[PDB]
Amino acid sequence: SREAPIEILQRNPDQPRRTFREEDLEDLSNSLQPILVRPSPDTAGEYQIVAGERRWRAAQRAGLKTVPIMVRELDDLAVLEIGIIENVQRADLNVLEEALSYKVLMEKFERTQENIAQTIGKSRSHVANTMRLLALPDEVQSYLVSGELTAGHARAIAAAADPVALAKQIIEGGLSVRETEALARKAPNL
Amino acid sequence: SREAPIEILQRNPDTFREEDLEDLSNSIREKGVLQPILVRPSPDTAGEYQIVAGERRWRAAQRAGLKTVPIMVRELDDLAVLEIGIIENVQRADLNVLEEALSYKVLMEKFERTQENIAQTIGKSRSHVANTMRLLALPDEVQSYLVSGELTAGHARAIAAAADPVALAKQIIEGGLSVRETEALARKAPN
DNA sequence: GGATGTTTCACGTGAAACATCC
DNA sequence: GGATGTTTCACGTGAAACATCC
């Protein structure tokens, strides 16, 4: 890990516009984990960030003249890929955003579930079940982000026919996940 | 600490997480502002006060719809700055359970806060605050297993009240027992 | 009665087990 | 056979219930 001026690092225009909560950044600012960089295609002696955009922003706030980088050369697709795998590992994301990240890793980057799981540190089951939530009706996906349903609830009624009817039953009756599992079990499937 | 209308307080002109504020709001809703707000006479108004410490609970009380909130006309004592420093550090949530327990013990002893007070402040439940602190009563051996990972909070908490906890900890690790199992183990201690 | 000490157990998670597809 | 699709259920957390102290 080489020391580098904070001036000569730049964010990746290609990988989507990451925004971070002021609170989280003010916290980090106030708090020596190297930033993963690669030689800048735009400049010559400058580096581009592949991972650690938060700490970079935090270091700027903390007023450091020079910040620890760790360089490695990397295809534009590899930097897109690491960008998504980093974003998932952040605990900020919600389950639908998390599922999309898994779908994109699997489609556009031809990764196996088992691959994604090993990479992101969860289990394959989890990766699989998370993605399945994208198959749910819009109505049911609304309840997931509103908070009216939990992942556990939604996942247990994914395989049912007329999930919306079960979701309504769950909310009205304030049912547990265990209860919904028994409900969906004795209901037809599509 | 005199009770004062929420109307007559104002912020220091020189972000708080919705979740955290909704939580506090609801605590103040049930138990009321358990920790006085430090104020000083308003330079802007005349009969109004300006807040020196407790902007969060003020905002929380407004959400809870309290007509009047407990104030204390007082400046920031070095102990007040030590106190805020610890309460901020706990809220960060980077810290581990033993560090968390110490923070609660110090808030309770050196700053004479009630468990219920600490809970409302830091946003966990009283039980939790109580049970977390109890882990400090465990032998060093057992506290080692908590940070090593060999035991979980749930395990340790369930054998705190036992005599010879170390013997139970050894039983747990050797037998790879669940928390439910340890609860049944400790339950059949004689008393 | 209200602060503190301790136990009990319903909860959603998460991954292992099982089922089906490629 | 190994990836993927889905179900089942053991797990620790977390907070309400219970117990004890002043």
Numbering used by the authors:
A (entry chain B): 44 to 74, 81 to 239
B (entry chain A): 44 to 57, 62 to 238
Give sentences from the paper.
In most bacterial species, faithful chromosome segregation is mediated by the tripartite ParA-ParB-parS system. ParB, a CTPase and DNA-binding protein, nucleates on parS before spreading to adjacent non-specific DNA to form a higher-order nucleoprotein complex. The ParB-DNA nucleoprotein complex stimulates the ATPase activity of ParA, driving the movement of the parS locus (and subsequently, the whole chromosome) to the opposite pole of the cell. ParB spreads by sliding along the DNA, in a manner that depends on the binding of a co-factor, cytidine triphosphate (CTP).
